[PDB]
Amino acid sequence: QERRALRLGVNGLPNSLEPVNAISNVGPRIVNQIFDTLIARDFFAKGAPGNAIDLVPALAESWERIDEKSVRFKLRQKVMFHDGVELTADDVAYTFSSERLWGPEAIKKIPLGKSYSLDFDEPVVEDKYTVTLRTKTPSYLIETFVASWMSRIVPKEYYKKLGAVDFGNKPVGTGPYKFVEFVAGDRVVLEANDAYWGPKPTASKITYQIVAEPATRVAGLISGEYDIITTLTPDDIQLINSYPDLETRGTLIENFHMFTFNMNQEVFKDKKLRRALALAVNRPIMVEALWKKQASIPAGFNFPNYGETFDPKRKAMEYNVEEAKRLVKESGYDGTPITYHTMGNYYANAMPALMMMIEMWKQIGVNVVMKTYAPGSFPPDNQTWMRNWSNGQWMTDAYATIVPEFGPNGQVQKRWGWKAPAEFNELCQKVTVLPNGKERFDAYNRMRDIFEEEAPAVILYQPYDVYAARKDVHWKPVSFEMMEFRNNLSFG
Template sequence: MPASLSSNRLILGLVSALALGSVSLPVLAQERPDLVVGVADLPPTLEPGKELSNVGTRVNYSIFDTLIRRDFLSAEGGGGSELVPGLATSWTRIDDLTLEIKLREGVKFHNGSPLTAEDVAFTFSPERLSGENALLPEGPAYFSVLSEVKVIDPTTLHFITKAPDPLLEQRLASWASWVVNKEDWLAKAEQDGGLPMFPVGTGPYMLEEYKADEKIVLSANDGYFGGVPNAATVTFREVPEPSTRVAGLVSGEFDIITNVSPDQIEQINSYDDIEARSVVLANSHVLVYSVTDPVMDDARIRQALNLAIDRDLLNEALWGGKAVVPNGHQYPEYGDMYTPDFVGVEYNPERARELLKEAGYNGELIKYTTQPNYYLNALPAAQVIVEMWKEVGVNVELNVVESLTGVDVGALQVRTWSNSTRYPDPVGGVWNTWGPHSGPQKTNKTWIGTEGVARFNELGAVLESTVDLATRQEAAWEMIDIWKADAPGTVLYQPLETYGVAKDVNWNPYTFYYMDLRPYNLSFEGK
């Protein structure tokens, strides 16, 4: 079992001194500290195109690499959007439909196999990721634009799209784009019955041990092209109870903890050797409504539920005013694709009561389902929202479940969810999360069969297949208007994500759930 970093801090000075001498790398590798991270939950697999979740990407970001990397440190606050080389050394637009990728030479997967263009082509292939019947069901949401990935030579590929795609480079730097080893993936897929649980990547850390619901241990990949990792091992230990994670940070059992609530920040900062580090996420906590449920099939009822939520009060009560209530399902980071004048969310309980009356709502029961630990503050938010809904005349019952595993999510009237902005554009936000390949439309079928969703899908197809700014703006702004009017759900707020961190761990959080432990973002020299 790897020792906590705190148990190794006394030898850091010795390690630094030795580094100035003639000590060989293998000896240094033995004396690097072990990092222990206390997390609320762990992913059930480490297949990077399947575990597109906050708990999954947190771990997978260190195991796998993308062709292009988004440099989150390029802007203050961990939200930079500059694109820099990853497994690709360069990328060039050959024409409106073709992006040429040049691969980095000498890169090896964790099993020792060299990275090849064939591995990349397989990663994005129709059978694995980009086709309508892909083994990874969420893949088409990100790469249905692909027509073909053509291998030109061992280090050159052409990504050919079905129409001009203004976001292809951003797609290759984002979710679902982590590159896997073809031979390993296929062998493990056959062994695991369809999808491999633990494919290999090229990242700075590789899987050493996996114990479901307990821990994931990663060991350093000293041959990493981005430099030798600064931790010998990284252990993600599952600790669902927030107070237990804080106690572990205080005692030195953990070096970093996740999902710190705002009311724990002052406590953590009161100690000399630990501190809270926070970012507002490029992610919104949302509610999902079933438009096909007989109680909720009138859009006016769903609109009423949205109007009855005082999001500013939720922000103050649960987040100390440090979360952000966005202007609908859109965000300023979209730049020219953002419309500041749109009224995205409103609090109007009187209008909510009027809409319920107009819809003929007669006190039918609505169940609000949430998990207590998956999303920070999800349960207290649900408890408050339930009372807000009761105030406008809704007969609502809170249904708390430990996990949605085995639950027919499509049958739930109201449930908690979150939407991450995969890339700084509406395609990476409302379209990815609510379009035809999304959970609400494809997997769970909670938003289907309305005139609004049909028009939304028409506009989304335009949005992702043209580079003309005016055309894209018109399509995107109508889409967010439809989403608000059809009300298949609602945005609550962008949460404050806070980590507790030992002060001698130099590490910066990002506006995504990625936990970047590469050498440029993790060191132990002290602050």
């Protein structure tokens, strides 16, 4: 009798298991198993229900902040990567290097590495088990960055030999499960790493099988094909819970769903029609109709996980149908249909939400039409106008995701053409280097106000992430877009 193999029915798969390129709603549930970070979040600290904020040692046994721009890490000794190579400071230095991650040479290998990274200087290797991470300018975000999904540790020699692309198809990490196979757009299979330095894996094997249609995914749990299924909606809860051997398990996660624009298109170069579309979205009626009250509507680009830079005083985002109609008229919009691209229901409630917004927009005089696209076939940028997206809020600080995504160095401005006000970009630079205080707090509030004025994206809500599982598979969700199995997976 060997350990049970775990069968997962998932909404989607990443195109690469290179851990930075796998950042998405579907990559972390896999790369969290293959790799470790220096510091890890313990969502279950002191009995919490999967939402604790505590950081604990992981690949680093201890660490110390030296000054405003450096942190020294002492590494756990005798940790082995899946191919046997011992983890050393040289691997950590390479993970956070100019070459691999944030320098100009990393642009083709990890396209978002520089824009999502801090203003890093080269790491300093002090000895085989001691490494210092540094920024060129002050950064009080080194610790939260190192605990995050940007900071999974890769093996220097193996990664350099294969290159980022081939490493992404045959990954080697220090994590509790090791790579077996990756069939693009179909499945990922991992196996127990019984040499793991931490809590030993409890499943013999893990299979991530794509089941893009949620109804088929629910039928596969009912029939006994899957142990756990992902990305359901609250409308599936009553049916699943009627089965005595199945149950749903859900939690609000530190992510928001949104829609955004290709601002290289003429109709979206100016803010007026973006604002008109934002002002016509009735979020509470969408939360009632599609989420059974379980989703949460934030007061702007502002979330409690930001800690000292969360503002609980902020007003709700605006809803004004009559001001929206007047903006449609002033924009010169001529009635032509505007497309909105969606990858089916990769996002829970994506197509039901869009159908509701299409009617809301018809009532303001804007004609929007759904265009679907297949997994791994994202349209050419110049064929897209509106599209859905999401952002995981990956730091204990407001820096992420407004600055990495929407800042002067980010993709919304550089790729998608948002001509941000100069004041917004000046504030992004200030919050990057400032320590917490009134100046920094007020700068984030001004950035949030400009974001709502400009509408380069429209925040909808934080999703209630719904899984379903067999009652004999013990596993709790966490408040983030990943699955955790360390000390959180057992059978019987």
